[PDB]
Design a protein around this ligand. Structure first.
Ligand SMILES: O=c1c2cc(O)c(O)cc2oc2cc(O)cc(O)c12
Length: 357
């Protein structure tokens, strides 16, 4: 209809018409590219979140939108945000925006860390939930590739859900190698050291590093490695971990990357307990294992779940995995704008009336 509008201005938050089902005028924030509002779901009789997506002018936006929709519709897990509904025109010709309806969450870990100290009990629970969700993701052979506090939503009872699969990919360790200083898209402060050295981020260890950075951030309310540019990120990491060992260096076969590391002055490890003097010692042991330089030696998700820090929560029978891996195209690079729009239309069909009387 359009009978509803939500305080427009910048972005383009003119119209927000989400059929008759959803009826309230409460803006929340700005998505990657569209207003997010809360609304009353007149069917389930609860407030929900709705993201307006207007992706159809940029190939990158469409790609990320399709990737996220395909993934979220296939995943079903307590610690991963779901899609409850998708609102769009009934034909491709008329489709100009897409609205994604999701459970309403109170906040995200970014906003929470800006103003709230976390108890060790909250840190432990939040880490548990992140890892529980990540187990499922990885079990589907999917890498999230952009884990960070703003991608972790929380409700009023501290239930945590991972969001934003726009940069996700299917794991491909056999094709992970690349040259030194290869450009990378995911958020700088949460990038593993190998991204800057010799890795395209196509293995599960990339996500464990990000989780380790999030744990550190929870312990002190500050990002642990706030690089200001691409290579600064690596110097922040080495400033705390110290210089890599001969064995870990020998693992980096690429000469430019090797020689860069060899060119650096020797740095000694900064002990975790001096960075985080109020932290639980078991938390720091787990942190150390997640923030391991060598990605091959880095802890895997399931090992992390089994670590003593998380013993109060660990229960592998209640930490589900995906029914089968994804092998769908997540690169989506060789598709014209017309095919991407068509795939988004097809992927969202299940939510249409389409066939009523
Ligand atoms: O995407 C969401 C979002 C998604 C949900 O399912 C939800 O329940 C709450 C959300 O809040 C946001 C707030 C923002 O400032 C920006 C956002 O992108 C979101």
């Amino acid at each position: 209809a359009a009978a509803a509008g939500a305080g427009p201005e910048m972005v383009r938050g003119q119209v927000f018409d989400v059929g008759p089902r959803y009826t309230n005028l409460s803006y929340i924030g700005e998505g990657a590219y569209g207003m997010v509002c809360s609304a009353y779901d007149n069917v389930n009789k609860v407030r929900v979140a709705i993201k307006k997506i207007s992706p159809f002018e940029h190939q990158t936006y469409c790609q990320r939108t399709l990737r996220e929709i395909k993934i979220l519709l296939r995943f079903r897990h307590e610690n991963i945000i779901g899609i409850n509904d998708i609102i769009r025109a009934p034909t491709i010709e008329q489709m100009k925006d897409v609205y994604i309806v999701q459970d309403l969450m109170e906040t995200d870990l970014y906003k929470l860390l800006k103003t709230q100290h976390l108890s060790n009990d909250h840190i432990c629970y939040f880490l548990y939930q992140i890892l529980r969700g990540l187990k499922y993701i990885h079990s589907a052979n999917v890498l999230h590739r952009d884990l960070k506090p703003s991608n972790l939503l929380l409700n009023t009872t501290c239930d945590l859900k991972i969001c934003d699969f726009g940069l996700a990919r299917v794991a491909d360790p056999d094709h992970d190698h690349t040259g030194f200083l290869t450009e990378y898209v995911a958020t700088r402060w949460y990038r593993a050291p190998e991204i800057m050295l010799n890795s395209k981020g196509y293995t599960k260890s990339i996500d464990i590093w990000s989780v380790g950075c999030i744990l550190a951030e929870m312990l002190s309310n500050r990002p642990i490695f706030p690089g200001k540019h691409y290579l600064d990120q690596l110097n922040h990491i080495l400033g705390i971990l110290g210089s890599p060992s001969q064995e870990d260096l020998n693992c980096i076969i690429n000469l430019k990357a090797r020689n860069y590391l060899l060119s650096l002055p020797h740095k000694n490890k900064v002990p975790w307990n001096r960075l985080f003097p109020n932290a639980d010692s078991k938390a720091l042991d787990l942190l150390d294992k997640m923030l391991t330089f060598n990605p091959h030696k880095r802890i895997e998700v399931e090992q992390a779940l089994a670590h003593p820090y998380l013993e109060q929560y660990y229960d592998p029978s209640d930490e589900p995995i995906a029914e089968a891996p994804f092998k769908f195209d997540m690169e989506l690079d060789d598709l014209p704008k017309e095919k991407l729009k068509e795939l988004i239309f097809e992927e969202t069909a299940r939510f249409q009336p389409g066939y009523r009387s």
